[PDB]
Design an enzyme around this catalytic site. Structure first.
Site, PDB file in Angstrom:
ATOM      1  N   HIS A   1      23.097  33.356  11.436  1.00  0.00           N
ATOM      2  CA  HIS A   1      22.077  32.339  11.304  1.00  0.00           C
ATOM      3  C   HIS A   1      21.963  31.457  12.528  1.00  0.00           C
ATOM      4  CE1 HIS A   1      20.395  28.534   9.292  1.00  0.00           C
ATOM      5  NE2 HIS A   1      19.421  29.323   9.706  1.00  0.00           N
TER       6      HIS A   1
ATOM      7  N   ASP B   1      21.904  38.362   6.805  1.00  0.00           N
ATOM      8  CA  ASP B   1      22.212  37.348   7.823  1.00  0.00           C
ATOM      9  C   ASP B   1      23.723  37.259   8.050  1.00  0.00           C
ATOM     10  OD1 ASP B   1      22.152  35.266   9.681  1.00  0.00           O
ATOM     11  OD2 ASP B   1      21.116  33.849   8.377  1.00  0.00           O
TER      12      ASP B   1
ATOM     13  N   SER C   1      28.505  26.026   9.056  1.00  0.00           N
ATOM     14  CA  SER C   1      28.641  27.358   8.488  1.00  0.00           C
ATOM     15  C   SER C   1      29.840  28.036   9.121  1.00  0.00           C
ATOM     16  CB  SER C   1      27.365  28.150   8.710  1.00  0.00           C
ATOM     17  OG  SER C   1      26.286  27.524   8.036  1.00  0.00           O
TER      18      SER C   1
END
Lengths: 51, 160, 160
Positions: free
Chosen positions: C38, C60, C112
């Site tokens: 991402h 992703d 993330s």
């Protein structure tokens, strides 16, 4: 006929090119210390395309 | 005299690099970031060297605008300046008559970019180079009006 | 609850860089190195950015294979997952019903790439972004079968 017409075309345009060339650097020097301060108090001198 | 000053430069000083060798310094004041363009080099940070710069060799200064991330990390500043004691990275400086002073030789070449303060906290101005004196030195500073910037350069100096 | 966890991320976490500014994270699990594709950027290491990558935007995700030098520096892993307490970089997480939970807002955008564990040591799975809840948050995780990978994405989320 050519020999006249090309020389008159080139003496006119560089002076056009000259005229714009120095008017801006005046606008540069008239503006530029105002760019520098930490403070945006530009006066009402808008005839000179103020930011 | 040092108990108020010391925290500030840790917040507000980057310096310049050229060939992995520091030479100058750099400040971040108000809204616009500051560099004395005399020294060649690149700032020692990743991103903000990617910035626009506006140069006039008439003053030998250089600014840009701070991007909004670390915009709240600059000092305070004013233009009100009565004569009296003031302070800097190597001690206390005296000022009157449009003339700044400090005693002999406590500054070197390779030292441009040192901001100078008051007592009560705002930053004042910024140094360039030195001048021989006999006893108490002459400075080379650029400063501010209410509205304008101005250089002063006394006779017989050397551009650091 | 932190006395077993802390040594692991020091062994097993690199992160990504783009324009001298970290944004994501990266893990090294089992035999294949992991990146959630991402976020744009480059990994912060010299050599292994020179590697092959296989991308599907359907999930992703992004993997590559670890070269044999630091191959013995990845964690353990399994697929057996009864419901109960589990743990992560900011505390303890609860899980049941195919639904992971932790209380409000202790995660941010720009985060993330955080692996999550058990008590007894192997790594479990890997996070993507958040979802508003009222009190105890919803997650966004990709995980494993005995044999296959799988995404789960509950309604009303934001991709961090």
């Amino acid at each position: 006929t050519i020999v006249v017409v090309i020389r008159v075309s080139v003496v006119v345009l560089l002076s056009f090119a000259a005229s714009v060339y120095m008017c801006v650097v005046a606008r540069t020097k008239c503006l530029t210390p105002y760019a520098l301060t930490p403070g945006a108090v530009v006066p009402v001198t808008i005839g000179v395309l103020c930011c | 005299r040092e108990r108020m000053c010391m925290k500030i430069e840790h917040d507000c000083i980057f310096e310049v690099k050229h060939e992995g060798k520091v030479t100058g310094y750099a400040c971040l004041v108000g809204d616009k970031v500051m560099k004395p363009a005399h020294v060649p080099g690149v700032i020692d940070n990743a991103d903000l060297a990617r910035l626009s710069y506006k140069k006039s060799s008439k003053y030998d200064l250089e600014c840009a605008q701070i991007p909004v991330a670390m915009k709240s990390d600059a000092s305070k500043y004013t233009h009100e300046k009565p004569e009296g004691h003031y302070n800097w990275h190597y001690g206390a400086v005296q000022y009157t008559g449009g003339r700044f002073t400090v005693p002999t030789g406590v500054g070197k070449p390779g030292d441009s970019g040192r901001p100078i303060f008051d007592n009560k906290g705002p930053v004042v101005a910024i140094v360039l180079g030195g001048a021989n004196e006999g006893t108490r030195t002459a400075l080379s500073v650029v400063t501010w009006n209410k509205d304008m910037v101005t250089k002063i350069t006394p006779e017989g100096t050397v551009e650091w």
